[PDB]
Each structure stands twice: as C-alpha cells, then as structure tokens.
A paper describes a structure:
Transcription termination is an essential step in transcription by RNA polymerase (RNAP) and crucial for gene regulation. For many bacterial genes, transcription termination is mediated by the adenosine triphosphate–dependent RNA translocase/helicase Rho, which causes RNA/DNA dissociation from the RNAP elongation complex (EC). Rho is an adenosine triphosphate (ATP)–dependent RNA translocase/helicase with 5′ → 3′ directionality. Rho forms a ring-shaped homo-hexameric complex, mediated by the CTD.
The type 1 and type 2 RNAP-Rho complexes both revealed the closed-ring Rho hexamer with RNA threaded in the central channel, but they have different Rho binding sites and orientations relative to RNAP. Our cryo-EM analysis also provided another Rho-RNAP complex (the type 2 complex), in which Rho binds near the DNA exit site of apo RNAP through its NTD side. In the type 2 complex, Rho is bound to RNAP in an inverted orientation, as compared with that in the type 1 complex. The Rho hexamer assumes a closed-ring conformation with RNA threaded through the Rho central channel and binds near the DNA exit site of RNAP through its NTD side. Four of the six Rho protomers are involved in the RNAP interaction: Rho protomers B and C contact the base part of the β-flap domain (residues β727 to β738), protomers C and D contact the jaw-lobe 1 domain, and protomer E contacts the clamp coiled-coil of RNAP. The T4L insertions into the NTD did not affect the RNA release activity of Rho. Moreover, the deletion of the RNAP β-flap tip, which is critical for the Rho-dependent RNA release, enhanced the formation of the type 2 complex. Therefore, the inverted Rho-binding mode in this complex is unlikely to be relevant to termination. The abundance of the type 2 complex in the cryo-EM particles suggests that Rho may preferentially bind apo RNAP in this alternative mode. Therefore, this complex could potentially resemble a posttermination state formed after the EC has released DNA and RNA.
Residue numbers in the entry:
A (entry chain K): 2 to 96
B (entry chain J): 1477 to 1505
C (entry chain G), D (entry chain H): 1 to 229
E (entry chain J): 1307 to 1362
F (entry chain J): 626 to 1236
G (entry chain I): 391 to 761, 785 to 1071
The structure:
Amino acid sequence: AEPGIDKLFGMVDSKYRLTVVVAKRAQQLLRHGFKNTVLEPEERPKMQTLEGLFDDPNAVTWAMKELLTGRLVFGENLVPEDRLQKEMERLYPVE
Amino acid sequence: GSDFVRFTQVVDQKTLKAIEEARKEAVEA
Amino acid sequence: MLDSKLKAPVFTVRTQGREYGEFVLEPLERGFGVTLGNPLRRILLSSIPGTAVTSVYIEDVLHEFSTIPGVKEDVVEIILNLKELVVRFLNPSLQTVTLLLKAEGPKEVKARDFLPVADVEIMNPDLHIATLEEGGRLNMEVRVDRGVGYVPAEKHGIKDRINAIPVDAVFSPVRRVAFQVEDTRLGQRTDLDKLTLRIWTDGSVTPLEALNQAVEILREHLTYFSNPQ
Amino acid sequence: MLDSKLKAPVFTVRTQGREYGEFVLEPLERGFGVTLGNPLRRILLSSIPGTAVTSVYIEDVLHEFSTIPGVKEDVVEIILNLKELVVRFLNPSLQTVTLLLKAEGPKEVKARDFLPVADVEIMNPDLHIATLEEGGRLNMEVRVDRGVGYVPAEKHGIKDRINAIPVDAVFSPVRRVAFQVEDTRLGQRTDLDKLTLRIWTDGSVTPLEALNQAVEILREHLTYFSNPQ
Amino acid sequence: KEARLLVKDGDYVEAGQPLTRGAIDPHQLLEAKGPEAVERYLVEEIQKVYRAQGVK
Amino acid sequence: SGRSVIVVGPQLKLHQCGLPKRMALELFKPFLLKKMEEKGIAPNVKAARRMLERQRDIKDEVWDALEEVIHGKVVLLNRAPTLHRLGIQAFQPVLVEGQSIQLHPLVCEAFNADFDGDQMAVHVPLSSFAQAEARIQMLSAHNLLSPASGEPLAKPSRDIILGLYYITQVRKEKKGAGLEFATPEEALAAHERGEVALNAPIKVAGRETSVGRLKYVFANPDEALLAVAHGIVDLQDVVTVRYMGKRLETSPGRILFARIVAEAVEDEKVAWELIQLDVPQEKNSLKDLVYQAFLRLGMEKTARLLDALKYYGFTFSTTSGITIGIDDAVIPEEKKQYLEEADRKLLQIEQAYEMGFLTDRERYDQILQLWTETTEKVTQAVFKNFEENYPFNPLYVMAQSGARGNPQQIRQLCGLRGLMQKPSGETFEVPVRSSFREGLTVLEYFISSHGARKGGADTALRTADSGYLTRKLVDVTHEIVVREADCGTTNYISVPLFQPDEVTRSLRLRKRADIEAGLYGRVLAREVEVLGVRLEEGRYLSMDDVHLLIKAAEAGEIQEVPVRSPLTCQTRYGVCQKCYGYDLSMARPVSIGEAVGIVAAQSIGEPGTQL
Amino acid sequence: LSQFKDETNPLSSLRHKRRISALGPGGLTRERAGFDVRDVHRTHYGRICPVETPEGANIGLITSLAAYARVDELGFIRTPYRRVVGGVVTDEVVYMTATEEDRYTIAQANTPLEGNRIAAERVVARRKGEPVIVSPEEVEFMDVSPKQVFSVNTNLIPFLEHDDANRALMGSNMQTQAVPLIRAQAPVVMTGLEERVVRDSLAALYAEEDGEVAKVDGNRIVVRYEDGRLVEYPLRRFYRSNQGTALDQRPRVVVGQRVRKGDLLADGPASENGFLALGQNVLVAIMPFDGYNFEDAIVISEELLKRDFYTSIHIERYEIEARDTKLGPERITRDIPHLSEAALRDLDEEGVVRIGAEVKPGDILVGRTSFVKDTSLRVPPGEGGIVVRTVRLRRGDPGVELKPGVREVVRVYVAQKRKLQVGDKLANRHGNKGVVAKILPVEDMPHLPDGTPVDVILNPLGVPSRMNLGQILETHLGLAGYFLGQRYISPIFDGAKEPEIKELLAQAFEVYFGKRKGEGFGVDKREVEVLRRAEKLGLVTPGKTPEEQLKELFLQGKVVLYDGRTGEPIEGPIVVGQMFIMKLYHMVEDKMHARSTGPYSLITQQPLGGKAQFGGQRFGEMEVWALEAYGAAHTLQEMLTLKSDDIEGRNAAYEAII
Ligand SMILES: [Mg+2]
Ligand SMILES: [Zn+2]
C-alpha cells in the first residue's frame, strides 16, 4: 500500500501523529501553491499518461515521501503559529 | 481529538531558519 | 522434405456443403494439436466478420413496441425474425444493402419473399418472417451491413429512417468451431498429434473460407513483433 | 497510423540478464493476449531446442543407488547437480558431445575440470558437481545432445556405456514462462488487453532471443496451410 | 424440594458459596464478596456464553 | 451519497473498489468541471455545467480528465445494516462500465453481504484532511485484524481455500506387492518393474519412498513443474526434489504453494521457514500463516501475499474442475449397518415398552439415547470412510477443508438428520430416517418444517434483540477512551490458569483458547520467572508468551497471573495502556487517545446477533 | 386491509389471491405475539402449506392454504382424503374437518396399492398427527395425494423430495416474483399443474367449445364454434402491470383452425403452449470458476444476449398538471423563457410532447411556467424509453374531477425494452438464488467435446451449505432431456427415480456418442488421459473401455469438458443439464440512487431531491458509530456540516471545489 509505512511509523511516535503530520503537509502544499515541497526536483511523484504527478495529482503521496525524507521536521508544538504562517506567506509567492 | 497529537506543525529546516530570523528581528536600534 | 517436413500435417478437407466442414491435419508433434486448435477456434468464433440486420424500418409503425393489424407476430418478434435471417454478400463492395419486402392479405411472409437483389443471396430463403392474416400491409426495409462480430443497436445508431430502428449486430458466420486432437500413430512416434477440426457455419461462407481468413488474421497478429521495443 | 494502427500493441521489453525478462505487449483486442500467450507459452516450453545431458557414466559406478568412496554424495545427488548444468554448442553439428572428467584427492569437482570441447562452451563453469574426499577415484563422461525442451531418461535410454546411465533431457534453455493479460483502458474503451510475459532462461540465450525463435517458428507453423488438400 | 445443592454436610464452605445449583442474585454476591469477586464472577458468565457460542 | 446493487470484483483488489463511472460522474461534477476547465473542455465552469448536464453532450476526454482528477482519490462504502466498525470501509474508486457495483470478493463476509439482492451505499470524504484521515485509518487494506478481538477479519474464502487445499494435497491409491524397498535397491528395481507392470501404483506404500520418488528426481523445482507441464506428473504426487539443500519428498502442489509464498514476499528464506509445507492446506493453517506473515513483514508484503493467494487459489479451484454430483454424496455402507443396528435396538425398546415394563418416559429416554449414540456412531464411520476410503471426496474434500460444511451437513445429506424435536421442543420418537439422497417422506418433511420455522422465527427475533443490546452497549460504554500514562495504581488481577470445577471438584489447567482470549497481550503485574524465562513486570504478553505460560501451567508452576486490568486501572475515566494492555488491530499495544469503549460495545453486541 | 394486486405473473397473482394471514384489524391478532402461532400446528396437515409463509418479521403470519383444501362453509378448511374401508380403499374423497380429522387414521398416499386394496400390511398412517405404523385395516382415510398437502405454489418444484424446507420456502416465494419474459419456456422437468395453472390463471385464452377459427388478428380473434355461432374476443397486445410489464395473450391458433371446447386460444404473457413458461431453460455446468461464482454469483455465457432469450418491456407512467396559482395559473406551455429553444423541438405540441420517441435524462416532459417563471415537466433521471401514450384532461373534465387548484392534468406513458444486463439476478425453482456476476465472451468459455457449450456456470459451494438435492436431480434430468429432446412430468415425491435416471442416462449417452462415432471419432487423447485420472481417483473402473467408462461417467451425470481459453479438457467430470432458471424481481433497489448536488428540505436544510435529483442517501446513526470507532474527526465533521445541514458551508465547499 504505502512505501516505508513501517519506517515512517518508526519515525512517528503515534499513528495519529503521523496522520496529522501528513495532512498538515498536504494542506501546506495546497494552500501556498503546490511548491511547498523539498524532494520534488530529482525524484518526484510521476503520473502514467504523462509526468503530471510531478505537480499534484495526489499531495498525500508527496507528504509521505517528504516524511520518508528527513527534509521536513514536524513538531506537535515546535514554532509560534503566527510567525510560522507569516514567514510561510512572505517566503512563498507560490500562493 | 487527542490534544497530544491533534496539532503537530510540520516544518522544514528553511522554515526553522525563517523563524530564526523572525526571532532575530526583535533587536531594536 | 521427406523425413520431417514430409512428416507434416496433411491438410485434408471434407466439407458438407459450404456450411459444415472438417479439416484433418497430422501427424502433429507434441502438444501442437490443441496448441493450435484452441486459438484457431477462438479466432473463428471471434474475429470472423459477417453480416447482420443493421437497422429496420417499418413503413407502418413508428415504435418497435407496436402491433400491425392482421399481423399475428409483433414488431419486436418480426425484427427478431429479421435478425435470424442469414444473407450472403457477393462483393466487398457489398457492405450496406437495404432489403425491402411488401406482403398483403392471408399470406405467410418468408425470407425468400424479399425483393431479390443482384449481388446478394438469401442464405435464409425459407426463413419464416411473418404471417399476414387479411390485407396485412407489411411493407418495410432493413438496412443490412457487413461487419465484424457484435455491436449493440445503440452504439452505431443507424437511421436511414427515424422511424427505422437499429438492432444489436451479429457478424460471426460461424455456428460452432471445435477440434479433436486425437493421438495419431507415426512409424517412429505413435505419440503424434492429429487434429480434426470440425466447424458448422451459417453457410454465408464456406468453413475453409473463414478458416484461412482467421489464419491470415492470426499471422498478422504474430507480425506485431517484427518491431522490437 | 494514429487510430487503430497506432492502436498497435507496444512490443515492450526489459531483460533481466539473459535468463530472465519482462515483455509487455499492449494493447490488445478482445481475446488476444491469451490467444497469443497460451499457444506461444506452450511452444516456448517444448519448441525451444537446447543442450541436455543425454547420459552419463562413472567408470566405477554401476548402480545409481551406489556411492563412490572419497565422494560422499550418491549417484542421485551427482546426477541432479549435473541436471542443471547448461551448456552451449558452437554449431548444430554439436548434436552429441561426450565430455569426460578425471579427478582424485580431497578436492571439489565443478564444471571447469572437464576437458574443454572446442565447439562446446559452459556458461556454468561455477557449477560444483561433487567433492573428492580423499584420493576420490572419479572417472566420468557425460553425453549431451542438442534437442528441444524436455526428454525423460528412460525413453532415450542413451547408453554410450552399457553401465552408463540414461539422463532425463531438458533442452529448452528457458527455465519457464509466465504470461497474463491485464485489462487496459483506452480513452474510449476500457476493455483492452495487455499481455505481459516474464520468462526464465538457463542462460543459453537471452529471453528476448528465445521469444524471437518461438514467434518465428510459430509463424512458420502457420505456413502449413498454404497448400490446399 | 427441587433445590439442587452441590455442597456436602460438614464440609467447610467459603462465604457466598452457592449452596444450591442454579443462579444467584448479584446483590448478594457483591455483599458476600464485595466488588472484585463479583467482577470475576460476572466476567466468567459473560465469557461462558461466548465460548458456548464459539465467540473468541 | 448514493446506493445501489453490488457485484464481485474478483479482478479488484481490496485496496481499490469496483465503481461504475456514471455515479462518480454526478458525484464529482464539481471536480469534473474543475478539471475540464483545467482543460479546454468547456469555456467556463458553467458552460461546463451545460456541457455535462446532457448524456449526449458527453465527451470522451471528460473521461481522462476525470481519471486524472481521481488518480489519487478514494471513497467510502457501506452495507445497509451497519453493526461494527468495518460496516464501512475506504476504497480507491475505479470507474467501470455497467450498472452494478464491483466488489472485492474477500470482504463479502466482512460485510455480511451475500449476493441475494441487497444493495450497498457509498459516500466520500471531501476535505484534504478529511480524505487523508479516511485513507489512513479507514482503509480496508489498512484495517486487517479484528479489533473487536484480535482475530484477522480478512479470512480467506471458500473457493481460494479449496483451491489451495486441493493443490497442496497428496494422493495414495494402492500397494499390494513388495512394499519394503527401504533397505533393498533390488527391491526398488523389482517394484519399479511392477510399476512398469500394474504391480506398483505410483502412490504405493514405498518404505523409503513410493515408486514416485524413486522413479523421478528433480534438482530444480521448475523441473517437476515442467514434468507436470508435459502431463508427466500430477500436482498431488509423491515426488522428491533436491531443495536448496534438501531432498524434499513432497507433492508438486505443496512446493508450488511454497513458491507462491516465495514470490508474494521477497524473503523466500522466511517464506519456507514459516510455512508448514508438510500438511494439506486448511483454512486454519491459512489464518495462522496470514497472521505470522503480517507479523513478520507487515501490511504491504502481507497484502501482496493475500492478493497472490486469492489469485492462485481461484486459478487452482478453476483448474480442479471439481464439481458436486449426487453420487458425490457417498453413503458409507457402515452407515446402513449402524442404521440397522439402531432400528433393531429401537424395535427392542418398543417391544419392551409394549408389555409395559418401560414407562413412556423410560422408553422415550431409551430411544433418545439409542439414536444419540448411533448418530455419532455413523458420524465416526463416515469420517473414517473419508480418511481412508475417499480422501478426495468433493463433498468430503470440502467438508474436511475449511471452505465450507460441517459434519452435520454431510450427515443430513449423506446420512440423515434423524433426531428432531417436536413443536414443544421434544424430539419425535421415530427420527428422520431418510436423507436427501433419499426422498423425504411427506409426513416426515411436514414434521421437519416445524424446526425450520422455529429457527427462522428465533433468528429474526434475535436480530432486533441484538440491535437493542448493542444500542444499550454503546449507550453505556461510549465514554471510555484511552487517555493516560502508566496508571500508577499497583492493583491488578491474578487471572486463574485452572478451571477448578469441571467435575464437582476438578481443578484443572483452564482451557487453552479461553486463556489466550483472557490473557493475550496483557501486562505483567510483576515479573515472573516461570519456565526459566524472567517474565518481567509489566512486560506485554505476546502469543508466544501465552504458549510458554500454557506449558508452564501444564507444569503447574503457577495457577493465575500477576497482570493489570481496567478494573484495577486508576485512571478516573479512561484506562492505562498498562491498565488496558495490548490488543489492537495492529500488534503493538493500544495508542493513547483510542475510543476503547466503543470498540468493546461493538465487539460484544455484534456477537449477540447469533446467540 | 386491501391494497395493490400482485401483478407480477398470473401464478404470483393467484398465490396472492389464495393466501390468508393472521393479522388484521388487530383484535384478531396483532404483530407482537405469534411465536406460538408461527409454529405450524399439526392441524395444518392438508390444511396449510407451512413452506409458503412469507419469511421475515411476518414469518408464520401469512400462508397459502393446502392446494386441495377448501373452506366448507365458514373459514373452516376441509381437505380431500381417500376413504379406505378395511383393506379396501375407496376412491371417494371426504373433505374432512380438522377436528373430525383426529377421529380417524389417515393413510399416506405413498403406500403402494393393488387398486382399492393396499399393497402393504404395515403402512404408516396419520392417526392424530402422528406417524402410526399400523395395518391397512386401521386407516379410515388415506392421503388423496401429496398435492393436497401443500398450496399451489408449493407443488411447482419437481424434486422437493431431496431439498430442505429452509430454502424450499425461499424458492416457492421467489416463484411469485418471476417477470414474464419475451420468450416463455416451460421447465425441462415439470410438476404437472402448469396446464391447470394457466387454466385457473386467465393468462391465455381458451376456446369455449368445439369450433373453428374465423379470424386471428393481432388484437382480436373471431372464433366460429361447432354450435354454428361465432364470437370474437379482443386480444391484449401490450398492457401494463401494477409494476409496468407486458400483458399479451400469445396468438396460438391459425385462422380456420379447429379448436375444441376449453381449447387454449392465445397463451398468456408467461405461457409457452398453454403451459407455464417464464424464465428460460439453459444448459448449465456447476464448477467453481475463478471468482464470478463466488458465493451465489452466476456466470453467464454471452449467447443468451445474442439470442433474444432474457428480456422484458418495462412500462413507465409519468404524470403532471397545471394549476391556477393565486400568483398566476401555471400554464402548461412550451416556453423556456431564459436561454434555449433547441430542446423544445421535442415538446412538439404546446405543453404536451410528441409521441413515440426516445428520452434522455433531464428531457422536458410537460411544459409549464409559474410566476412568468419557467416551471415544466422533464424526463426523470435514470432511464426513459420511447413515448407510447398520453392523456390530456385539461379543465375539459368529461367525467374526471381534477383536484382544486389543478388547472389541468396530464398522463404520459413510456416503454423501455429492458434486456438482461450485468447486474440482473436469477434463481432456480429448487431454491438456490443469486445474481449475475459476469457474462463472458462465449469464444473462450468452456465447451463440450461437442462444440455445444453450456449457458451458465455456478459456484458449487452453495449447494452443500444448502440442503437441496432436487436441484442436482433436475440438473441430471434436464441434461438428459437435452439429447432426448423431450420433457418429463415428475410428481413431487411419486415422480422419477434414479433408476430411470440412469436408464435415460444410458439412452442419451448412447445417442450422443453413437453419433460421435458416426462422425468418425471415438475418444480423444484428452478423454483417455482424463479417464485414466478418474481411475486414479477410482471414479472410473480401471480396465474398462474409454467408451464404456465414459458411458458410466455419463450415467454419473458427469462428463469431460474443454476449456476454450486454454481449450484444455477439465479434470474431473461435471454434472450439467438444462435447468429452468428464472429472473427474479429486479426491484427499484437495482437502480442507482446517486445524487451529489440538488434540493434540500424546507424546514431543514438536509438535502432532499427525488423527482428532480436522485436524492441524498440515508446516513443512519450506527454508521456514525463506526466512524466513531475510527478516528474520523474532520471527515465526520464535514459529513454532518458540509454534507448534512450547512447550506452556507456546503455551498462554500462547492465554490472552493469550483
Ligand atoms: Mg443478502
Ligand atoms: Zn490506567
């Protein structure tokens, strides 16, 4: 079903924490434009009829893959939300 | 509904550096 | 070719009419009998194009669910009797043909009763088509086309007449194909195969006709590999 | 073409070594992927000629239920460990090659100790057949013939030596094959065919090469109908 | 007369021991044993039906 | 939301679902317009509305647009009467042609949904987070083990089970001549000639080996594979093949199933290491392997195996050509002798009553016992009949196999369902002496009608009764969830290991399965070095721990267990993991935040349906 | 008390019309206490068929009386019984009162007799609802027939003697839901009442007396009787049912055709030749196919669609009206004010539509405008066939009373020739049910040594759990009748016996393979190998001729088969036969009920469509409970807010998706 689900499980303290993390990352990709990715360039989700999956046919796979990478850091309470969103909005013109 | 998990912000090192400069911004004069 | 090539299936043919035909090929090496008779039967039953009642128009009725006076059979029954008609094309230029028939009174409409046409044959001349009781005005026209296998009336949607109707398509002229791969006994090898393939056909084509047609088709299907990828 | 000839099965291939290979052809029409694999799969498992040890003889060995001192394994084990031994002829004239092997001492005997045959080459020089335990007297000779597919030992009963042993023959260099037709969707229709065949070969050739053979010879079998009779 | 009793005369018997064969009022069970013993009892009768009906 | 009839998805994997397109059409009209405006399909979203409002404005490129949209999308499917957590599950939709809904056949029982006409419904999560949560913990491919009790709910079905049992079964037919080949190879040669003649059947009692193994020796199993391919060897045969380092004397089908295991999961080493290739494959062993493999590799490789198993079992079930026939109902002649025995004994009882010595109760009870005896007599006779006489009885192969059937069904068909109660509940004297292979008597069938009517009535009443009970259960248990750290309460329950009254005074190591049900995945209230293993305090109770401790209790080293319990859980509301313990649909002990009370309500009320 | 009439099939109607229940006004008996009543009283013998009762909550509540039993004067069933005097039975039949029944010893009909005298001294009898194995002289009456024991619907499954009541009731019940087909076939093996069935059930026409045909037109028949008279009877061509089916008496007589008294004239919609004919007889082989015979799934070959072999016409009866609103009467007009006239071509006449046309979902049916505001009828989502009829009762009410406000009324009739499709459902008389799982291209489907392949392949695993051997017995019987090209009459228990079964097996096998031999072909290598393997399993005696051992296999009712896809012969002989299988009521639940967006309630904002849009599906409570079992927090939030009540939120999500 999902690659490295055991690995992500090990890196994730609770299954529901992994769920929340994945969903937060996916909605991040969505809201600020899909460019909110860290492993996109070289390896990337890719479609079948074309390479359309490089963009966002299904974000959740993107979040899972980035989680398989150590690129993202998810804190249950890691940063003040106001400044995190503010810096996301300054540094992402992908909108 | 578990508060222990229900909110867990996901952040990249670039976001960490962004918050770092946001903190550094507090220096006046 | 004396030892092995001469030791090749003797394609022998024994056909009752152009409808039924048997072909015996032996001796056959290990497992070739079924190995070949199977896809041969499959293509015979599947790929062989044929002819069927393409669309139907009754001059008298608008909707298939009606009944015509002095007509014991009903509209759908009649179109069914039409579909059961077996025709025969005599030319590749023979693809679309609108047969017409007009009958009246206390007469039984047979499939021979249609208007004769030049390049066509009524493979079903005696096919009971209808039976008119008294002054039964049965005048109508069926477009018949030369197709492959089956298609529902819906997809083609053929309308020579808006009052004319489509019907599901049946273009396999094969009644049934089988092949008995029985042990043929060769001097050195009794363990040889001898395949006698029997086929009942509609008669529109002769068995060997669809036979070599399918053999042709299959050989192209093989040629799909001269291209490496 | 674009519609239906571009509607041509993609003869896709990816060979994992010369022994294994995936081969996906797609798409296909109704009842074709099986129509192709089944006959072809049958052919590849018996049609393919290959190298198989017809018989073997140990000078001292006179029952296969016997074991050679200085050689722990019994006749059964040595014969089996030689069964998989796959060789490659340099020319069709290598119809039969009998290679002998001499060995004593506390040593392990693999395929390399065999006396080299000019036209015969072993792609399995690493195949360790036995272990000489202490001055183990082994003199052996294996007759191998160029044949097709599988041949049981008893039916040939090859006796180059009256105490030599017939060997079950397996010539088809392809270890085996697995084909399936997966349903594939085109923009218009979803009921389409994609036949994928992954094959295992002894290494005598690459799976692609064996496919080339089988397909060509099958088309040739399709040539057994041109003469009418 | 019908009281089907299992215990014998003279035999020492724990309190709350069912003197007859049949069922028991849960309240008297709690009274004699207090909470935990009644808990164990009831869990037993709950699992007995499921095992009798193959439930795991 | 929507609802309509379903159809099996034998091609479908449970990770997906069989979806006729024309419903997803209306459903995703929003996303469809989104995409086809994402394409040039319509000028605007609303020109799109007009374009798509007609079945005759239909464009095919609508199709690839919709497929592109749904590429990474899933929906939820459910049955009309929902009773448990899996009464709905998440599937990745697959647009299909036709009206009916295509269904992965395995869950045809997870949902108590046959193919008698009942139609199921479906909805969809919409929000990105909502879809994520649905796919994460509501995926069927994610929802494997029963959380009610730790049983897997994906139990393989009858057809696949039968296919694998048939493939992995072995045969033996006859041995008459010299069987004692064990020592003599002259014996092998002579008996091999007798096999050359009719003297030796292949499945003869070959002491060291049946003629099958001596005759044929295979280094690489592809060898025997081809031999079968040449029709040389049947799949249930006694053959020898030099396995990786072993001369495995097996049936072909046994090695082939082992190979199936090998591909389904990469590490074929463990694949054979964890497989009991030495027995005919039965549903119970099926579940055992399913469980252990899920333990070893996890979700993905286990499911790979599950799908491959479904495929191969279907393949082999079809290949078997095995069909039921009236003659498949083999009436053992032993049964007719038992039947004459019972009839003569009943006549004896009746004659003893006739002059009055037996009371109507006395004669009635004597007859009752006589038939209750002869019934098991014939059951045993027919059973033996199967083991030796007809190991390959389609009827017996099935009944013996876990796919379907019971001894009672076979008896009722092969033998007779003789003893049946009257309208009151008392069994009629003259039992049902005929079978279905026999023609039931008019009055006998009339009488048998009564029990069937009672069964229908009480099952129908039990349906609503179980609904009521579950309703109360959820009413009361709904509050309870796991939200806690180690509930420091040093209070546990010592779980007895002995059922002390099976006889009035008979204290005995309590039953194994019950012990597993009560104690699996528990928390050691304190360390216990029982069989030399220091079962430390709080250490969770694995099944292998269950086995160790069952063995110890057989040793009598302990009669109960220091182990935690919710009852001794300190947490005011909620239970400690330690206070609760282990059981999940996954292995590791429960996670904090899990609504355990609901799970218990379901697990308990659902069974009441069949009580 | 009175409601719709059961217009599924004439048999369905008659059963419904001759069945009594317990419940009623309530005082007689209300719903909550039937346990004691639900069990079949002993007195039901010859009185009530205990297998005809509707299963479910109302199980034991409703049943058809004994077929031969009838009310004498006052709701009191008396049943025929063969008088038996001493050792002499009397053909005189006395309809006994249930209470009077206890007064005697009723002998069973199965007992052999030499005429009026029994053929066994020791014979069972029904003294008072008990098996009393007594001398022939101890019976005052003997069972007239097994038929009297049951209602009509019970007696129409041939081999009941080897089937369980649990599913016998199921089959008897499903017998009612049969939809008359385009092609009416009679069972290969029958019970014997289909003639009486179509006789009592007025589906077909019957000639009063002796006479000849004057004229037989598709809608009329003038007969001229031997009495010198002539009378014509209009013939029902297409008449809708309570459920919208066909109603025709099949023209069965040619003009100038001499018909006797009571001679069937035009067989009813579901009669073959004055014979019950619904559903069809199809050659069937039981074998566990990949997954399309999973539990009770039925696998069908393509041919039954190529042939016109399972279809019926479904009739749809729509209707609308114009009202005179105080805001303004709702004119039934052709006008769609705003945008388009193109779709208005179909609405040919003003307000009313043109007749005899196909309809797509959403097509205007009746035009009209409210306050002007466009408010007109359209084609319901789903499927509409071809326009057939219309009725237009405007203010001009000749004898109609259009309701107040109703400015006018209008009725519309469409027809759709529904062919059998993928999702359809079928079952046999012997109880086993199922739904079509897939129709396979007949090209690769398994085929006999003879090219003739079977029609349907079943999953055998069903039968063993079920307790019904009569079905397999019928399988053998129909397989035999196939080559025999002839039918059979099997009384439920007195009918055929397996001895005659094997006789017909030998006869039919001899026919089939004697003509095989005449073909110049005996056994094939495939046959020899399979026969060898049957010997290996002991199914065929080793050493017997492949001819003879194949003959024994035939007498086994099983034979060899070839694959078709891999063409291989099938290991293990398979029993097959011409099975008379019916298509059950494919009720409305079959149709998709799949609505995404559309209407909502008035008082509440819960979505509710219906006539305009399919409608939101019931969500229930325990479903939310299951969601609770999972951690479905925001998905459930969405369901109850974005998909349940919140108009503003639901439209906001609409636009977000947009
Ligand atoms: Mg059901
Ligand atoms: Zn706790």
